[model samples]
Target: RLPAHLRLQPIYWSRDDVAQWLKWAENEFSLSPIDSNTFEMNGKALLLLTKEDFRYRSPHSGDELYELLQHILKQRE
Candidate 1:
């Protein structure tokens, strides 16, 4: 489970919140270190990103990241 603040809908996440989320994911999933700058956008922009965009941003773990986002979104439904 995510921290309380991060539990909010992705659309509500600010850039800082997004950064924190990325860091959390890195640890949670034991993923390779990701450049937060590559994902330097708020949740709104995040929502607009495609799997390909994620791949372009972080090649090693982009697919997993995309799947995680999909899971997050689905949980809200």
Candidate 2:
């Protein structure tokens, strides 16, 4: 289950909240360690990123991460 804080809309997440979500994604997906600094923006900014942006930030697992993000974003629908 997603943590309570992470369940909030991505548009409302703070930078720290985004970081925590990244950490959780890393563990949940068994992905390599992603650089949080590469994604230092708040969730509003995060939502604006494209698939290429995620790939630019984390080449190793960016596509997978992007897919996960989309999945989470779809939760509200």
Candidate 3:
């Protein structure tokens, strides 16, 4: 499970990137379809996510999101 302290956030990427991240997250974290597409901030506060469940904004990027997920999952291990 993701730590309560780790905040997940929306990431903006190309369509292929979105597909790739979604797939990777599924395999890596057992991330659900719904959970895969959400943004978290301020220690669990959901933020300005889109219908597609991601956002193009400051301090948010696909690479960042992926790395954070990896780090959190690594901590879980």
Candidate 4:
């Protein structure tokens, strides 16, 4: 996640050009909601972040949260 002020806002850091970054976060930091998929960070002290949960109201979307995790299995060398 992009820090505020530093980048103005959270860009989510996703794009075809920076697909590697997206892959890393997907591979490393994933909070899936599919097939009972659930996991959290290890908090290795190397990264400054937090495990959080929240609720919000949306006009368009039915659910408060929606996530799609690209099932990445079997490293492609």
Candidate 5:
């Protein structure tokens, strides 16, 4: 929800938008909710993700979580 001070601004994602994005990630990359939420790689490896990680990882490798997180840096003021 947008706070009173930011009422004129829009939220980054709606509930429906978040739902669909998670669905897309699941279907595209076989991601599970637990691993996705905790930022674990199928409970086998930990993700030491950082902004620099994007420069090294390939999106086509089904790294949808990283792709989604990349949007965190894509905000406009």
Candidate 6:
């Protein structure tokens, strides 16, 4: 849902255009809904990790949650 201050953008891509993009995405890369409010995700690991991302994105400023992903990614990168 666009906010009141935001304007709706027009869709320039046709159905086939978007469908082809989805097909290529499915073939070259993999992504899925890793977590859900009503159901379990892949496993507790992914579920918990995604929950961490959610809180990280929309955090409760005062309620801090310990997450080491930043350090982990930084080490690898």
Top candidate by TM-score:
1
Task: Give candidate 3 regions above 4 Å deviation.
Answer: 1-12, 33-77
Name the best candidate (by lDDT): 1
Question: Which regions in candidate 4 have their CA more than 4 angstroms from the true location?
Answer: 1-17, 31-77
What are the per-residue Cα lDDT tens digits for candidate 1 across 10-66?
999999878888888899999999876669899989999999999999999899989
**What TM-score against the true fold does each predicted structure earn?**
0.92, 0.90, 0.30, 0.20, 0.33, 0.25
What TM-score quantifies how close candidate 5 is to the native fold? 0.33
Write model 6 residue lDDT over 2-50, tens digit each, in one string.
Answer: 1222111112323333333334333433423222121222223322455
**Per-residue alpha-carbon lDDT of candidate 2 for residues 35-63, written as tens digits (9 for 90 to 100):** 76668899899889999998998898789
lDDT of 5 by residue, 1-77 (tens): 22223222124443344344445556655665422233313211222455355234434333555665444335435
RMSD of 6: 15.2
User: In candidate 6, which residue pairs get closer than 3 Å at backbone N, Cα or C atoms, i.e. clash?
Assistant: none
Steric clashes per prediction: 0, 0, 0, 0, 0, 0
Worst 10 residues of 1 by lDDT: 68-77
Residue pairs with backbone atoms closer than 3 Å in model 2 (clashes): none
Order the numbered candidates by lDDT, best leading: 1, 2, 5, 3, 6, 4
**Model 3 compared with the native: what TM-score?**
0.30
Candidate 3 clashing pairs, residues 3+ apart or interchain: none
For every candidate structure, what is the RMSD over all alpha carbons to the true structure, in angstroms?
Answer: 1.1, 1.2, 11.7, 13.5, 9.7, 15.2
Candidate 5: deviation at residue 68, Å?
Answer: 3.0
